[PDB]
Write a protein that binds this ligand. Sequence first.
Ligand SMILES: Cc1cn([C@H]2C[C@H](O)[C@@H](COP(=O)(O)OP(=O)(O)Oc3ccccc3)O2)c(=O)[nH]c1=O
Ligand SMILES: Cc1cn([C@H]2C[C@H](O)[C@@H](COP(=O)(O)OP(=O)(O)Oc3ccccc3)O2)c(=O)[nH]c1=O
Ligand SMILES: Nc1ncnc2c1ncn2[C@@H]1O[C@H](CSCC[C@H](N)C(=O)O)[C@@H](O)[C@H]1O
Ligand SMILES: Nc1ncnc2c1ncn2[C@@H]1O[C@H](CSCC[C@H](N)C(=O)O)[C@@H](O)[C@H]1O
Ligand SMILES: [Cl-]
Ligand SMILES: [Cl-]
Lengths: 237, 237
Amino acid sequence: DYSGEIAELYDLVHQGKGKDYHREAADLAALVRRHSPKAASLLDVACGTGMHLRHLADSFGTVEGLELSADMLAIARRRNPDAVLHHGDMRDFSLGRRFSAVTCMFSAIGHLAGQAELDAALERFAAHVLPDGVVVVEPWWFPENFTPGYVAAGTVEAGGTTVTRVSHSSREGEATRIEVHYLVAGPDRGITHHEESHRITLFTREQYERAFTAAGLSVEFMPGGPSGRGLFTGLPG
Amino acid sequence: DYSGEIAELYDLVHQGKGKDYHREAADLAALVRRHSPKAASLLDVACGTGMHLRHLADSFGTVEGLELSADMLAIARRRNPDAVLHHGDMRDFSLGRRFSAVTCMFSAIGHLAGQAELDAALERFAAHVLPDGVVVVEPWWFPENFTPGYVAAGTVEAGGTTVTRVSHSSREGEATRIEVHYLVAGPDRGITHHEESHRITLFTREQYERAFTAAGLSVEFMPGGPSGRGLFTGLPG
Ligand SMILES: Cc1cn([C@H]2C[C@H](O)[C@@H](COP(=O)(O)OP(=O)(O)Oc3ccccc3)O2)c(=O)[nH]c1=O
Ligand SMILES: Cc1cn([C@H]2C[C@H](O)[C@@H](COP(=O)(O)OP(=O)(O)Oc3ccccc3)O2)c(=O)[nH]c1=O
Ligand SMILES: Nc1ncnc2c1ncn2[C@@H]1O[C@H](CSCC[C@H](N)C(=O)O)[C@@H](O)[C@H]1O
Ligand SMILES: Nc1ncnc2c1ncn2[C@@H]1O[C@H](CSCC[C@H](N)C(=O)O)[C@@H](O)[C@H]1O
Ligand SMILES: [Cl-]
Ligand SMILES: [Cl-]
């Protein structure tokens, strides 16, 4: 879940971590146009708080989003008041139109539980992409590149609020268990503590490739990517 | 209270905050010798983890400590294995000897509850100081210099452990309420959260002066001091 204070802190936490959604969006837009020169529309699946979408809207005449968390989607709609942002589930949704690109960024795909859900999501992405368009999926880490025991800590301040965030990652079967704690402080607020836990699936490279292929997409992996985890692209046909 | 993990984290937290106990001790030793040129002994009251004492031992032939927290004192004794460190209460203790200096550092005096306890502690300090010696007390903030709403945050790493500490200070009658939260993280540890709360008395400058005078000490205040809170010195007679 991405509800409540988690959702409210998300953008500030990733700004403090230095995530550059503007540069990621410009790179994404150029990648789409590389494959589809007259591309004019984009669907961002698991769009979160709509940071990519806000920048992509400066580049594509139609951008839409899909998000399962109502609290994340509320922030996305406020950020993107002129865009249609849909509530729904990447495993099983139907918008009744296709787009030049279908994107799923920042390892959101790792919230799927196993091969059947991964295959289902990829088939939905293929069902929403145009024939000269592109499906873009930023994976979670592969098992061979996952670092168990990893601790990340950072602090950011904005508007009078100080937020400290610490994460810890461990191996739990075929998933990463990530525990995240926050201290949120301010002159009137005092200090409040928050915590959450995620299980993010460690799909192998071959499992992603299998899901793309079963959806009718030809698949390519590029290492590095916006987060060090690489990027998969898929073209219909 | 200064027990358990609080005590265990104390030195790492103040090292990350940049507290320089070596420089503070050299300054203290020179201040004592300024008043008592043949000074050879020192008692550090509320000595905590014994950081000042460890450096003062390089300068005075006899250093002793007094500390009410068994967990702080355990760390102090490990740091100072050749020194006599006493368990007891600054309000009412009796060592049966006097010292060239009696010191009480880093606002430990603010854990006393009102004028009667402050007067009692100062009388005990005078009862343990030699006639050419000096009593040194680092006060808490005076009401006029206290900053309500203050938030301090910092993170330090050592040995594989990451510690984030956040404090928040507010006014609660004639005391500061300080809330402190910690996140302690490591590759095997995971993340653990700890909290504590202190009530530190906001004695006025005149209240400190009154306690010194009632103990038979002539009192001087020097602003700035090791922590921005100044320093009181008191000479018998
Ligand atoms: C260099 C490196 C890191 N990691 C893992 C270790 C850890 O799991 C993650 C880095 O931690 P954090 O910066 O908190 O990342 P996010 O907020 O993106 O993760 C979340 C994802 C989902 C929900 C919550 C948090 O990458 C690896 O597995 N391999 C690597 O080489
Ligand atoms: C500049 C400034 C600060 N402060 C206050 C505001 C706040 O109360 C304190 C600074 O906070 P922190 O760095 O956490 O200090 P310690 O660990 O020494 O405090 C503890 C004391 C006892 C138990 C726990 C913590 O000084 C003032 O009152 N006036 C000032 O001008
Ligand atoms: N089955 C699902 N369908 C749609 N969104 C999902 C989902 N499972 C998880 N999510 C969403 O996946 C997101 C992961 S955080 C990534 C958000 C965004 N793409 C960004 O780059 O910042 C969350 O917003 C979460 O609610
Ligand atoms: N009545 C009392 N008698 C003795 N020590 C006391 C006390 N009340 C509080 N203390 C001690 O006061 C200390 C405050 S922290 C300061 C410790 C040390 N002087 C330093 O500079 O680091 C704690 O170790 C606490 O246990
Ligand atoms: Cl606030
Ligand atoms: Cl550890």
